[PDB]
Ligand binder design. Structure first.
Ligand SMILES: O=C(O)C(=O)N[C@H](Cc1ccc(OCc2ccccc2)cc1)C(=O)O
Ligand code: NI
Ligand SMILES: [Zn+2]
Length: 346
């Protein structure tokens, strides 16, 4: 059952596709979650939007310039918040000689220049934009409404959390980065690349996550003492040579326009954008996440403030265990290898 924990790809027919929660349970029955990250190529006649000609006017309220500091494959990224700007401006800068993708043969070559150059000429990421590019009538895999048990949060408390149960758009240019992290509350995530250049990704298997944190702690001892979960600040960059050199297993995969990626609970991932592009993203859940939600180690220094109440989930899906949990005595140990309960039928 994916015993080497490789990153997997799936091409679901239009009908395997229509029901989202069940396609996730399917890929878990096939071993995908063990890699932490998977790719799903939608069926060629599926489409979320007719055209992107019309967005040049859309506002990016808070772009950020990414300053990166470090050497020897260990880096910290600092975010400069810049002035609001529309997409067409962002595109001009992305495609300007100043900021655009260097020329290259194989991916491995672009990968090398990213790692060699990521502290130079800091770029700007149109990150964290509230909104969606899905036509309002598209029903399969609409990041606006996946319809998973994550919806229990909004429904029961009214609470919406931007980018977690609402969608984010991310406008990329060359060399923009996403630091090593698992999702808030260790939720799953979904990323659709609407268009532009690729987004490349690295991933560590959840069953080795602990090994990545142990490591990251030695590498950034200062940050660890000030916060258990410093990685959740999303400021820590670590190259694959370092991972490789300290024997931490990971895989790499490159995502193209029109492709989806899913991350799994507690799957550490990172990457960078190849050039002008645009991805949309949100978090979701399945029954199996609940236990990761109860056990997630959270930012203790209050930079990352996102925190979902588990109560509703435990009561509703783990009735027997509610009281043991509540009196802080639920000692379940997660087994990162199991598919979610919803998968049995496969
Ligand atoms: O789909 C996902 O799970 C995912 O992590 N996508 C990433 C989202 C991300 C994650 C971490 C990032 O680190 C930099 C940063 C952190 C906080 C605020 C603004 C920028 C930046 C972006 C992406 O597409 O760039
Ligand atoms: Ni993520
Ligand atoms: Zn913290």
């Amino acid at each position: 059952l994916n015993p080497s924990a490789r990153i997997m790809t799936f091409y679901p027919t239009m009908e395997e596709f229509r029901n989202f929660s069940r396609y996730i349970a399917y890929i878990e029955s096939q071993g995908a979650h063990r890699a932490g990250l998977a790719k799903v190529v939608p069926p060629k006649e599926w489409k979320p939007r007719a055209s992107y000609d019309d967005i040049d006017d859309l506002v990016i309220p808070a772009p950020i310039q990414q300053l990166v500091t470090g050497q020897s494959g260990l880096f910290t990224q600092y975010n400069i918040q810049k002035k609001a700007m529309t997409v067409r401006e962002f595109r001009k800068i992305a495609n300007s000689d100043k900021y655009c993708t260097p020329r290259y043969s194989e991916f491995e070559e672009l990968e090398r220049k990213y790692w060699k150059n990521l502290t130079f000429n800091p770029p700007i990421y149109g990150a964290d934009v509230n909104g969606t590019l899905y036509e309002k009538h598209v029903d399969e895999w609409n990041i606006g409404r996946l319809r998973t048990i994550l919806d229990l949060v909004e429904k029961e408390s009214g609470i919406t959390i931007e980018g977690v149960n609402t969608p984010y758009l991310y406008f990329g240019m060359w060399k923009t980065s996403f630091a090593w992290h698992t999702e808030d509350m260790d939720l799953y995530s979904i990323n659709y690349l609407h268009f532009g250049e690729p987004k490349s990704w690295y991933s560590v298997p959840p069953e080795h996550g602990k090994r990545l944190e142990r490591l990251a702690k030695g590498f950034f001892p200062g940050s660890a003492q000030s916060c258990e979960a410093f990685l959740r600040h999303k400021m820590t960059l670590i190259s694959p040579l370092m991972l490789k050199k300290y024997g931490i297993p990971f895989d790499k995969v490159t995502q193209e326009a029109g492709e989806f990626m899913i991350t799994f609970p507690y799957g550490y991932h990172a990457g960078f954008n190849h050039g002008f592009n645009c991805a949309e993203s949100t978090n979701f859940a399945t029954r199996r996440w609940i236990e990761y939600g109860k056990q997630a180690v959270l930012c203790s220094c209050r930079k990352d403030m996102v925190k979902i109440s588990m109560d509703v989930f435990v009561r509703k899906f783990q009735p027997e265990r509610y009281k043991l949990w509540k009196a802080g005595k639920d000692n379940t140990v997660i087994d990162h290898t199991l598919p979610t309960p919803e998968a049995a039928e496969f």
